[PDB]
Amino acid sequence: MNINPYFLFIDVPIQAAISTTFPYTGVPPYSHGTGTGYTIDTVIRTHEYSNKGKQYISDVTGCTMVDPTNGPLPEDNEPSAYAQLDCVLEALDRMDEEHPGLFQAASQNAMETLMVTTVDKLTQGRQTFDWTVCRNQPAATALNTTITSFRLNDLNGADKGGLIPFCQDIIDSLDRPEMTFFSVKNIKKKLPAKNRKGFLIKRIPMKVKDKITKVEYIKRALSLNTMRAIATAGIQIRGFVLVVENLAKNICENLEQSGLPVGGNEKKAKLSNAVAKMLSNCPPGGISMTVTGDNTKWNECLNPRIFLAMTERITRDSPIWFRDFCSIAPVLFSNKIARLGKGFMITSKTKRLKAQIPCPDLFSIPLERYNEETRAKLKKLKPFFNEEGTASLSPGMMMGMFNMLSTVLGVAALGIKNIGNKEYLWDGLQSSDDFALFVNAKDEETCMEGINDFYRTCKLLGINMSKKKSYCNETGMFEFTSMFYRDGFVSNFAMELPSFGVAGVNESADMAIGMTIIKNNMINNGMGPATAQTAIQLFIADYRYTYKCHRGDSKVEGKRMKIIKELWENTKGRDGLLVADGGPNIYNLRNLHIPEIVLKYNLMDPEYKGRLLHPQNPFVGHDYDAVSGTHSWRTKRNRSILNTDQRNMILEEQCYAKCCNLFEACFNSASYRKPVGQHSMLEAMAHRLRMDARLDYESGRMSKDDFEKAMAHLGEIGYI
Amino acid sequence: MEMGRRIHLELRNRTPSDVKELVLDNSRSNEGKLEGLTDEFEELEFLSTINVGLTSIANLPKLNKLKKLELSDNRVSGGLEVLAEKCPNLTHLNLSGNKIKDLSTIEPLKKLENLKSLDLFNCEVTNLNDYRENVFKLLPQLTYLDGYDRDDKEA
Amino acid sequence: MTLAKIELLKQLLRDNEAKTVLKQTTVDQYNIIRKFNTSRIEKNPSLRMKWAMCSNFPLALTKGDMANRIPLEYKGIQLKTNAEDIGTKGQMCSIAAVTWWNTYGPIGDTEGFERVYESFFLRKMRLDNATWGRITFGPVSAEFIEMLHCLQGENWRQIYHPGGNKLTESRSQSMIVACRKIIRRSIVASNPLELAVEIANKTVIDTEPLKSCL
Amino acid sequence: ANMTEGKSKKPKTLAKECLEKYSTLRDQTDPILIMKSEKANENFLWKLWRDCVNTISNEEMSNELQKTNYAKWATGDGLTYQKIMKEVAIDDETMCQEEPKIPNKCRVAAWVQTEMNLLSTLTSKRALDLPEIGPDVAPVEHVGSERRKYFVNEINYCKASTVMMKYVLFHTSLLNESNASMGKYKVIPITNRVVNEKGESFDMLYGLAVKGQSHLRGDTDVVTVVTFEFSSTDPRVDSGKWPKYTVFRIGSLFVSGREKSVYLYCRVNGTNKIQMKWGMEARRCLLQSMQQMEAIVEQESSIQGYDMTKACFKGDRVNSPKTFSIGTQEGKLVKGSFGKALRVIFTKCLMHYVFGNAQLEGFSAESRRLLLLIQALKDRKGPWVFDLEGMYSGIEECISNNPWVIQSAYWFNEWLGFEKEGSKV
Amino acid sequence: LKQMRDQEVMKTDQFIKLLPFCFSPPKLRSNGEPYQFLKLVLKGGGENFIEVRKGSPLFSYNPQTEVLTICGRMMSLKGKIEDEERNRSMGNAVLAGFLVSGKYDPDLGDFKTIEELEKLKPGEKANILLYQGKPVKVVKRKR
Amino acid sequence: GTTKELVQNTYQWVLKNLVTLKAQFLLGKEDMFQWDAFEAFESIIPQKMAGQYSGFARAVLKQMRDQEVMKTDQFIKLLPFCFSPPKLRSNGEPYQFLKLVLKGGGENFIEVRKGSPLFSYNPQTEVLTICGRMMSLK
């Protein structure tokens, strides 16, 4: 009997059968390498779909620029980035007329939020491209480095605290003839280390001051570095994109078509409501069709100039300063420069050699030495390449940075609802990459005529529908963002599942975080009761393994398990003991939002309650919900190097190695005989030698003459 | 070496009805048969045929006393129903290393009722879901198999 | 030899730099250089704590009478360390120490604890006084959002009602549910009459038979 | 197998005891080579295995190899190219970029069908022991508990569960060994803890594996590990199944008084820390399969207004035990209980996780659209396609060399043929 | 229970532990011999298991104080325990058709799993383990 | 030495001087069975039962000499066990066995019928695997 798993589809609808095909909503490790080649291909494709536009030379950054907007309309079904401004303006006009007082209110709310916001908001983000060092650093570190450089350059926006002064100082820094900043430089090492020679070589960083001309800083600020996001943007762009996205979110929240920022069962409600609404107003005897459309090269076709036009149209009645503030982001994106990453690698098999060619030296060697695909890619990329290992890139959107504005543009495309006053009405939903289109007509022929008209219209707006990944069927069954809807039933394609291990804070905190994660997964991603209970079981298993807190009545052995077993033997209320103390777990679906301390309080032993919740215990000392007890301990978090200046100047003197060598013998002869606790190493040596001489004389290793000689020398030391 | 040489060595040039067992191993056969064993045989208990290149079971004396038979490392692939008409008194069956395609090949053993142990190792039929259960409900007379019916005993 | 080390130390003291570094840098500072010399930071917090727990003294400890109350050793198991630490500027304690505190530690007074964390106790009380109903599958309020994980799903709905200080009809509120269970036990079993009467006769609401309450 | 009371012991001691029980295999010094890889050297692998067993059988607590010679020379760790300054490469004319080794194209592999068939069978041992949960009160909790009971009862002893547990445990041990030992070779036994119906628990040893050094601190950097796993299957039967393995013959075991050979499949492999994390997370196949089964049950209940768990598993008075079309027997459809469907789902999820590469995920993502269109066709919804050949090209772009992808394509073709021939009725 | 009754090794702990399981109709093997087990699992999995030899969280016995522990609750069995009960410690009430005859003899070999016990033949002696550090030697019996 | 080592050495001593034992076998005298080499072998057989093994081996070897022809592998396997004096049944017949257990139990066992982890001779190629080591007998 040869199994055939696909045969399940015979007895089960495919929508349910393929539920949760991918356990991971993130990124796999085996995805096609996103290196210099991938970014080169991305820029090549971005410039390829817009090569019929206007090509010119930027007078600021001196880089090639391509502008496809208002360019010739496509004559082929291939992707096109030529979005006419008039069509976009008309679509925005239609949206505004349909929703009176929407753009004004959204712009007002966005500007008020910007006025009340603070620079600290910029720290909530993923890896950010720091320009001072030209790398990827955490948001907080990047913001701190930018602030320090601004202070060095007589720019103190962060001092005022507001975000508006910070962005004003950013755009002012874009005007300084020379920009001075701090940078980190690594220098080799010569300090001792015991492997076989008491000598090792490493890298130590130091802070230095570096200055850059105006054009260099201008190019650096617009740079987009690469680490399914393809690149990250520095700090000079973060505030403006934040404001523009807040505006777009304010607009979208009141757009019934927008599929964002819906999350949870609200998504299912929106899907079913849209289907029901479209079916209700279907013409008597007409036909309703549904397209699960997808967009190819979504972010490689949208143009920053079109986003600038959308921002200008939306904020047509708003203070001029806010209009400029909103416009600062699209103009920055329209001049974005991509960084190609590390570079390539070329090898010689005959001599068994290999080397890494960095981006600036990409063209330093004949193209014949690159494989076919890289040769062609470099040949095509030559015009859009800079001498500093960067590529000019005017068009494109390099994945998600204006997702809300993309959704707004898609909703505008969906809001036309008719072309030529034909016998079809279209509508649907769209969330920043994917759209579901519902069209009502008389016969399927007119429905497909309407679908064709919608395809042409979105082409006019620069949105390219995917013919190779889209299909149409009678309304009632479709998909929308990995969520299959079928005549009321709803299923998910990919659902994130709890990862192995505890959260990584502490016993009570880890338990609370795990339970709240399970609860959130149930609420949002739609995890069934049995799956949630199994997740609880797995989390308990992992927690017990990590904290070595198996059941008190178990037969396992461990350093902590002996005390756990003794406590279990001495305790009467064994149902009230916490899991961390080998007690029984009692968590279930109905009580996934209650801390275990509160759950078990009524069953705890009063003596155990006092010991556990002692107001002054030595462990606690000085989101999720838990109880502050003896299980809220803190782990030692102290590493790296402090006292950097003193340590560096000491290590750079000379005699440190001799001190280490003298220390090593005596204080390694025994595993631990160090009077540690801030004792000066000289004092510890004096005490150690005094004790060694005492022991030598007592055992007879030394005569009285050597004894007295040693005590005189030690007398000169000062600790005797 | 040939089946005849093995027959002569085992019988030592005596009457056919003098040995209740045979060892036909490492013997070349004409087109994959078991010649050299005449139908005159009347008493036989144990059999052993390994590396004989037997491709089919169509030549075998009619018998009523054999209880064990051993076939291995052969490309035989065909119905075994003929065993019922030739000797429906088998108790130990060994097909380890044989070449059987699907479950249908072992079907004709249903009509035999005295079989208690059947062996099928590294057989193309052995790599299937519920092959153990499917064979069991297909041959109710079977009391043993590759060795793990319910316990472990030795032949 | 003590004399050899002594003479070498004197010779080293002849130089100013060695004398200065030995006078200022402490034994605690000596460990720091070796760390960065051959150690650095790691990632993957889930595994980080897994490694940390297996160590001897991963837990920070406060300084005070309570900290010194727990012993250094217990049945051949170490708990904490005497020498001061660098980072925490205090003692460090082993994981087992916590368990020791939960077993033989001083017994404090927890009076008024419910008041401090009253919200969680209110949530637990509301959950306890729930009256769960039916569960209905697909078609084909401040106190309600908190439990939403157990009320509504993609293709199912749980009928749940809240509670809170609804005391007064205690006895009644008891008998009904008890009686309900009896029926639930009798309907499934064949000939429910005798079994139902048997269970009803042998049930007591904590002091008295169900018959008297009914 | 080595029956134990149930105590937890270090892997080194467990491997030592397991080899002591099967002393004959441990003391094997003359290898009877049976098959060889195209590039690997049999002598080096055998000497490395001998060093590994010597280290396992010694007395020192550490599991660290001391004869680094054969370990270093066997995994090709000395053949890595030396990096030179970029300036020399620019000046040099013989240093040129190498073409990408695109995956080859392969036909249907018959061993994937056997893998799926066998991993879905019920063995005599189980390797799952999950903790307890609080008492169930709400009806939803009761439904979930019943579903969990049925699921675990069905797939407790399934061989797929044991294989998954071995995989996750081995990857967890590999990740742990990389804690502080990065510049040294570490021997790691491929062990497992198993429990049978009678209740007695065994500690199985499936072989050893020596992990090399990763001087670079990066987490996405391959650290070569060579694994020697025991087996009872002669590779000569399916020569095409093992073009990448080096196999010896160590000895022979006795189970029912009968001698069965034992081969040692030795293979070099390369994986990074992120791959260790992926292997550790590979336990998510349990939740994945449970979610799939729960979606099936939820759909069945949504047809009605009440839960359909017990009815679709055991059957009530009104309903009948639901049966699923499992596979094919002599070219004819065959049905089976919901338990078999659950086991097949679990095996499919486990194989998807194990055989996962970019090709597999892309193929699944596009077969999603193809399957949805087929479903729309089934429900008489009159589907329309704009560029069908575009979808077909997108799907076929991923069928190059992955065994799972190729077998999935074969099964999809078979099922599509069955649907076509069954839709005419 | 029948084996315990026939040859007087009546042990209160084993009797109490194994009495409830005797309801269901017997299901013997094709050989006509009763199955063998090490621990009997109950519904709910995990902790819900009764150990046939040493003790389980659901059932444990302390003969030093003669205390019975059921699901974490402790009781005293004074008056229900015979003086000679302790001497016949455990080995005569852990397997069907097996009785104690000696002590740990490394020469006979290591402990034998239930798989080998079930396939054993009468008159053959084997070794078993009750719990860590308390092995015993038993012999099969026809009765 | 370990039990496996003792079995290996005893069987190797038997194999090397095969001519002497095979010649003494035809005569049919107890002198050949009372060799010094088997004394150490006597240490690796259970004392309570070694005599039964010796009696059974002696009986089977006598039957071999009487009512059949040469069979080297079985003679090899059954020779070493006869050093200890026998313990015949009460009636006077020899005890019958098919699995000779050895010190250490478990794997340390010889199989009378075909072979075991310590001893297994395949005639198809005439190769004798002893304690995980193959000798040739051609």
Residue numbers in the entry:
A (entry chain E): 1 to 227, 239 to 633, 655 to 752
B (entry chain G): 1 to 155
C (entry chain F): 1 to 140, 227 to 300
D (entry chain D): 292 to 716
E (entry chain F): 601 to 743
F (entry chain C): 541 to 678
Question: What does the article say, verbatim?
Answer:
In the nucleus of the infected cell, influenza polymerase (FluPol) uses the viral genomic RNA (vRNA) as template to perform synthesis of either capped and polyadenylated viral mRNA (transcription), or unmodified anti-genomic copies (complementary or cRNA), which then serve as the template for vRNA synthesis (replication). ANP32 is required for both vRNA to cRNA and cRNA to vRNA replication. ANP32 comprises a folded, N-terminal leucine-rich repeat (LRR) domain followed by a Glu-, Asp-rich intrinsically disordered region known as the low complexity acidic region (LCAR). First, it stabilises the formation of the replication complex, an asymmetric FluPol dimer comprising a replicase, which is part of a parental RNP and synthesises the genome copy and an encapsidase, a newly synthesised apo-FluPol, which binds the 5’ end of the nascent RNA replicate to nucleate formation of a progeny RNP.
Further refinement focussed on the replicase or hANP32A-encapsidase moieties improved the map quality and estimated resolution to 3.3 Å, enabling relatively complete models to be built. The encapsidase moiety of the FluB replication complex adopts a very similar conformation to that seen in the apo-FluPolB symmetrical dimer. The PA-ENDO(E) is rotated by ~48° away from the PB2-CBD(E) compared to FluPolA, so there is no longer contact with the PA-ENDO(E) 63-73 loop as observed in FluPolA encapsidase. In addition, the lid domain of PB2(E) is also disordered in FluPolB encapsidase, although there is some suggestive, but low resolution, density close to the PA-ENDO(E). Human ANP32A binds in the same position and orientation to the FluPolB encapsidase as in its FluPolA counterpart, but due to sequence divergence the interactions are not necessarily conserved. The total buried solvent accessible surface upon hANP32A binding to the FluB replication complex is ~2200 Å2, only 66% of that for the FluA replication complex. In both complexes, the main anchor point remains the C-terminal end of the LRR domain wedged against the PA-C(E) domain in the vicinity of the N-terminus of PB1(E). A critical contact is again made by hANP32A 129-ND, but in the FluB replication complex it is D130 that directly interacts with the Pol II pS5 CTD binding residue PA(E)/K631 (in FluA replication complex, N129 contacts the equivalent PA(E)/K635), with also a slightly more distant salt-bridge to R634, whereas N129 hydrogen bonds to PA(E)/S411. Furthermore, the PA-C(E) 550-loop of FluPolB, being four residues shorter than that of FluPolA, does not reach so far onto the β-sheet surface of hANP32A. Additional pseudo-continuous density is present in the FluB replication complex maps that we interpret as tracing the path of the hANP32A LCAR extending beyond residue 155, the last of the folded part of the LRR domain, and wrapping around the encapsidase.
